[PDB]
């Protein structure tokens, strides 16, 4: 058999990979976030210069397989205050935003269509009527609670996914005093937080998610897993047309490979490219978290400058990055 630290080998009790540990809080650092939620689209292979001192491929180039995760900006819909107790952390109270998008309202219902859409109705009414209760609760969190987690949901509509329920979750707000975290959450109420503001493509992060099920084996598969030290290679912007165009390559193109991502679609929003494989198949939600413990060796610290990113047809033996140059080489078709 395998390692005894992973048994009992049973199905994960959650579709979305839940964070089990957040980086330790620091008052010296100002107020920011630590985790983000994305959707796996697939991976390609890229050619990257190797600036690895002491290595035998120093000042050379290697080919690396890199997973692409679409990460549309996340909407902060609430905040949760946690108070330390002799029996552990306890959720003291929760404050939600006044207006919640249908994407996050669909989470509370198994049948949103048959529902009367009554979620947060009186909550929105009391929010508009009197703000003294909201002020009392926020003052309660900043005075008593020691850990602050913002409720954020993903804009699943932008992703080419048939699912319309947003994966609501909590992001621990590490940095500054408790009042600073509360002020940060209130300012960011109803707004959007971007992965460009959270991660910046040169740090060492961990990816967590549920693996894909292999059926029945002599149970094997569909288990919660935590990959450590997955390096971000590029946080590409969806709007920019140079997202998949490096400086050594030009050739204006998009990260979505020609022919589309297999069983996922076309990536149009901000995407994240991580070195190596990540758990879960395509179209499954993955969670990203910062480094709990600081460890930047040369591999985790060296800068990265991509040279060429493959966008060939992953469906089948693709042999052309873009239909433009495909038509330039291939003879003119009958159509």
């Amino acid at each position: 058999h395998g390692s005894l630290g992973f048994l009992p080998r049973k199905r994960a009790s959650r579709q979305r990979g839940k964070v089990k540990a957040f980086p330790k809080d620091d008052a010296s650092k100002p107020v920011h976030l630590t985790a983000f939620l994305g959707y796996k689209a697939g991976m390609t292979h890229i050619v990257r210069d190797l600036d690895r001192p002491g290595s035998k491929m120093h000042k050379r180039e290697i080919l690396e397989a890199v997973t692409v995760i679409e990460t549309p900006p996340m909407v902060v819909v609430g905040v949760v205050g946690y108070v330390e107790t002799p029996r552990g952390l306890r959720s003291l109270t929760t404050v939600w935003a006044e207006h919640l998008s249908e994407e996050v309202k669909r989470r509370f219902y198994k049948n949103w269509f048959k529902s009367k859409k009554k979620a947060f109705t009186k909550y929105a009414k009391k929010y508009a009527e009197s703000t003294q209760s909201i002020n009392r609760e926020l003052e309660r969190i900043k005075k008593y609670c020691s850990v602050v987690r913002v409720l954020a949901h993903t804009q699943i509509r932008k992703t080419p996914l048939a699912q319309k329920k947003a994966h609501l979750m909590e992001i621990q707000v590490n940095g500054g005093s408790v009042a600073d975290k509360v002020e940060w959450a209130r300012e960011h109420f109803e707004k959007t937080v971007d992965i460009k503001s959270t991660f910046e493509q040169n740090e060492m992060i961990d990816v967590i998610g549920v693996t894909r099920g292999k059926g029945n084996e002599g149970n094997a598969g569909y288990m919660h897993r935590t990959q450590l030290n997955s390096k971000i290679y590029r946080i590409g912007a969806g709007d920019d047309a140079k997202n998949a165009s490096t400086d050594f390559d030009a050739t204006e193109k998009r990260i979505t490979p020609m022919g589309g991502f297999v069983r996922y679609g076309v990536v149009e929003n901000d995407f994240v490219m991580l070195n190596g494989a990540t758990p879960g198949p395509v179209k499954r939600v993955l969670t990203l978290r910062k480094s709990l413990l600081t460890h930047t060796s040369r591999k985790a610290l060296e800068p990265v400058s991509l040279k060429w990113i493959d966008t060939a047809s992953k469906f089948g033996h693709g042999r052309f990055q873009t239909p433009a140059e495909a038509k330039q080489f291939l003879g003119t078709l009958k159509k």
């Binding site: 290595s55 035998k56 491929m57 120093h58 000042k59 050379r60």
Partner: protein
């Protein structure tokens, strides 16, 4: 004669190539070898720490003289651009598409006369004559096709394998128009070119080269 050893190898000629106008050192290894080379020739001729074909065998892969240099066809486009940028404009750099890419191990060339391997291509010989501007002779050293590896050629003298006949050594010396000595370097290492590199005014030998070998090289090169 200067004693140096790249990493833990006494075959300095494998990891580096020496000419009368420029020097090349391996990339990705230890900077001590490059510093040692720069300490003796940095202020005289340029030294480029580059690689050919993504390997540290550039010394035995690249062959040339003070006028021009030749690189194997396996050299990358970026590598060739880096070499041209580092090397002076008067130092011509040309790529050779030969069946034996080991130019340094097949052909030994001086500033005036060059000896190539017996199976060198006519186009390669024409390119060598055009670039290096030297007379190319298709012969063999000590009966071995690897003339560039078994023989060391320079402007003031040449070194060959000690097993060669006296008449053969005299014929090679007359053909090369320079003195020739049949000896060994690095304590019996028969690959003189791999074990030692000699320029017009200086020579570099491995750390395992004996005192008698160093004295013989100094007498032959008159350095």
């Amino acid at each position: 004669a200067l004693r140096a050893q790249f990493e833990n190898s006494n075959e300095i000629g494998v990891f580096s190539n020496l000419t009368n106008s420029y020097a090349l050192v391996a990339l990705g290894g230890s900077e001590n070898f490059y510093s040692v080379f720069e300490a003796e020739l940095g202020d005289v001729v340029p030294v480029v720490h580059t690689t050919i074909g993504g390997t540290r065998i550039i010394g035995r892969l690249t062959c040339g003289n003070r006028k021009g240099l030749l690189v194997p066809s396996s050299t990358t486009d970026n590598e060739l651009q880096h070499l041209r940028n580092s090397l002076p404009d008067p130092v011509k750099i040309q790529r050779v598409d030969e069946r034996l890419s080991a130019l340094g191990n097949i052909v030994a060339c001086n500033d005036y006369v060059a000896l190539v391997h017996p199976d060198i291509e006519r186009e390669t010989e024409e390119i060598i004559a055009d670039v290096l501007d030297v007379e190319v002779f298709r012969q063999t050293v000590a009966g071995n096709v690897l003339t560039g590896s078994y023989c060391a050629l320079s402007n003031q003298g040449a070194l060959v394998h000690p097993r060669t006949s006296i008449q053969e050594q005299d014929e090679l010396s007359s053909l090369l128009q320079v003195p020739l000595v049949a000896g060994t370097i690095n304590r019996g290492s028969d690959v003189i070119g791999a074990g030692l590199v000699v320029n017009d005014w200086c020579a570099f030998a491995g750390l395992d080269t004996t005192a008698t070998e160093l004295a013989v090289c100094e007498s032959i090169f008159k350095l």
